[PDB]
Structure 1
Amino acid sequence: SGFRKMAFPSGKVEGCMVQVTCGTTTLNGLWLDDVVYCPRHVICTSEDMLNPNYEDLLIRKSNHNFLVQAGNVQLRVIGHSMQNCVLKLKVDTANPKTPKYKFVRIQPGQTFSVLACYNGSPSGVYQCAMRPNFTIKGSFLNGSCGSVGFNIDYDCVSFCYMHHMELPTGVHAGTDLEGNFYGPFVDRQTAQAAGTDTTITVNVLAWLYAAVINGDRWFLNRFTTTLNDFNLVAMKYNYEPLTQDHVDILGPLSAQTGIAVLDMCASLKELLQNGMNGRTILGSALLEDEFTPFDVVRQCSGVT
């Protein structure tokens, strides 16, 4: 029993983190096989960052200008290329700790673990979600760029995020490992505002199921609703619309608890309209939306 915001064990990702320096800029790289992936803004002088032309800046850079350090040992850069907003630094040594891995692009609402790094060195691990506005609410200081987000399926690390920047509002933006930003963001120091950070309804419902499984039941009520009725309430409270696809994904939690998804929708509806009245659910005073249905099943069943 108990339900915690839980990150994947980070060891397989710790073994991939390196330091990348170009000129006076130091940040993190991800070493998989004989390629080091890092944000392309490693080539920018803070002056460059206001209106950088990355193809033009990159012309002034040679392999020997990219300093790649794995622990206290230098790696030899034998090639470099730009793919979207990341650099691929080809090195002469395959990472001997390379795990089984994939590059995936996640959808809003999907959760992942972040291994926050500085100078190629792991500092902490925490759980994030891709927000509906394609930001993440992270913990990233200068030096953390190139830190990565990931999921693990048994022994295969799916890399989904690389950290690139902080918006003036202190929320975070980055890329998949193909260098494509999530959302409309660009690696330039310019006016970039986030859209509405709506609540991930399906994740809230998952977490209410987690609460019932863990003995927190006070918010269960005598009501049901319909997707259309619920969605009117969701819209009013800046919750994501619930689709039949989300109902289908919650089916295993419905089955385990014997609470119909639309009944749990009606519980959530009353919580939105009535508030918590100073009560808590799984130690929270607000409705948690950074657990996916899959996360809840994982944690409630002890998958390794």
Structure 2
Amino acid sequence: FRKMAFPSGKVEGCMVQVTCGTTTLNGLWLDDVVYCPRHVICTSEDILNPNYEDLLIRKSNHNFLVQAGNVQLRVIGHSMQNCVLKLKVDTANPKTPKYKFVRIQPGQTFSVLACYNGSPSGVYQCAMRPNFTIKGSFLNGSCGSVGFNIDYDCVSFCYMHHMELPTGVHAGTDLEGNFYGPFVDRQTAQAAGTDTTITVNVLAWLYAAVINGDRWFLNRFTTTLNDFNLVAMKYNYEPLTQDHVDILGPLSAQTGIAVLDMCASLKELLQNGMNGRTILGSALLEDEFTPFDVVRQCS
């Protein structure tokens, strides 16, 4: 059982490089529009406290240099949707997949294609944390890299990368340019809310462990949903809803372990610790696999 990303080829064919003045970052080229973070327009002075509408009205199409590989795409119009710039180009991307823009909820996972200078560098799986950050791997020039899920040849874009917080976690927007979380695209100190652990995902991962032949953490105890939630909240875990219990149904039926029996296992893990043992090679409880992720990989 590995952390597994979606194949990235459908997204690689959409990545381009966008340069405005001194700043170069990545854009997403779909049909005849390039989407990118609007902070590309800022100078190093503007970026400390930008007035974006005032800055954008002062730009011309020719201020934007868009490069797909070696070929320059001519920008023929530009507008702003929240924190995302939409550059209209005179060329349609023949590699445009079937796609949708979606806003994901905390606890959902997605694949990130990290890119620099319009060229894909790496792919990995992330979860939207309950505090609306992501624990990514992004360096200078990674902005405009996107996160996505793939469902039968349809790419659902859910994240565009904008910034790194002082704690090393990351923040960005949906493809409508709205940030996940209380963050802003301004270079100034910003912290996130206290994070919590994605309970339904920890349980899904415990089931993945059982599917892969590990049972050391199970016990013979039971719990009610409410009593489990009291202990979960005490340990800074998210509430488990009846919808979550239902979503875990396939995994419970495959292993024969009732959801509330798995909750009693997790409760014991939280109260006693792992005593130096590991689950699926991990010394900590892993919360970045959803129930769907486990099913997709295990079957």
Q: What range describes the TM-score normalised by the shorter chain of this pair?
A: over 0.9
Cα RMSD of the aligned pairs, angstroms, is 0.6
The Cα of 1:277 is off from its aligned counterpart by: 0.8
Which stretch has the larger CA shift, 286-295 or 184-193? 184-193
| C-alpha distance in structure 1 between counterparts of 2:229 and 2:27, whole Å | 42
| C-alpha distance in structure 2 between counterparts of 1:252 and 1:93, whole Å | 46
SS at match of 1:122: strand
1:66-116: CA deviations, max 9, x gaps? 100000100011110000000000011111000110000000000000000
The Cα of 1:59 is off from its aligned counterpart by: 1.6
The equivalent of 2:194 in structure 1 is 196
The equivalent of 2:105 in structure 1 is 107
| C-alpha distance in structure 2 between counterparts of 1:188 and 1:152, whole Å | 31
| C-alpha distance in structure 2 between counterparts of 1:65 and 1:174, whole Å | 24
Structure 1 length-normalised TM? 0.97
SS at match of 1:159: strand
| C-alpha distance in structure 2 between counterparts of 1:168 and 1:234, whole Å | 28
SS at match of 1:19: strand
The Cα of 1:255 is off from its aligned counterpart by: 0.8
The Cα of 1:293 is off from its aligned counterpart by: 0.4
| C-alpha distance in structure 1 between counterparts of 2:264 and 2:240, whole Å | 12
The Cα of 1:232 is off from its aligned counterpart by: 1.2
Gaps of 5+ in 2: none
1:169-189: CA deviations, max 9, x gaps? 211110000000001111011
The Cα of 1:216 is off from its aligned counterpart by: 1.1
The Cα of 1:154 is off from its aligned counterpart by: 1.6
1:117-170: CA deviations, max 9, x gaps? 000000100100000000001111110000000000020000000000111221
| C-alpha distance in structure 2 between counterparts of 1:295 and 1:120, whole Å | 29
The Cα of 1:265 is off from its aligned counterpart by: 0.3
SS at match of 2:17: strand
- Check if 1:168 corresponds to 2:166: yes
SS at match of 2:186: coil
1:182 pairs with 177, 180, 194, which one? 180
Gaps of 5+ in 1: none
| C-alpha distance in structure 1 between counterparts of 2:241 and 2:16, whole Å | 42
Which stretch has the larger CA shift, 191-200 or 31-40? 191-200
SS at match of 2:7: coil
| C-alpha distance in structure 2 between counterparts of 1:119 and 1:179, whole Å | 21
Question: Which runs of at least 4 in structure 1 moved beyond 3 Å after TM superposition?
Answer: none
The Cα of 1:250 is off from its aligned counterpart by: 0.5
| C-alpha distance in structure 2 between counterparts of 1:283 and 1:226, whole Å | 29
The Cα of 1:236 is off from its aligned counterpart by: 1.3
SS at match of 1:183: coil
SS at match of 1:115: strand
The equivalent of 1:265 in structure 2 is 263
| C-alpha distance in structure 1 between counterparts of 2:133 and 2:44, whole Å | 23
1:181-235: CA deviations, max 9, x gaps? 0011110112321111100000000000100000011101111101111111111
| C-alpha distance in structure 1 between counterparts of 2:166 and 2:81, whole Å | 26
Percent same amino acid among aligned pairs? 100
SS at match of 2:210: helix
| C-alpha distance in structure 2 between counterparts of 1:162 and 1:217, whole Å | 39
1:11-49: CA deviations, max 9, x gaps? 001000000000010000000110000000000112111
Structure 2 length-normalised TM? 0.99
| C-alpha distance in structure 2 between counterparts of 1:258 and 1:196, whole Å | 35
| C-alpha distance in structure 1 between counterparts of 2:271 and 2:105, whole Å | 28
Equivalent residues, number: 299
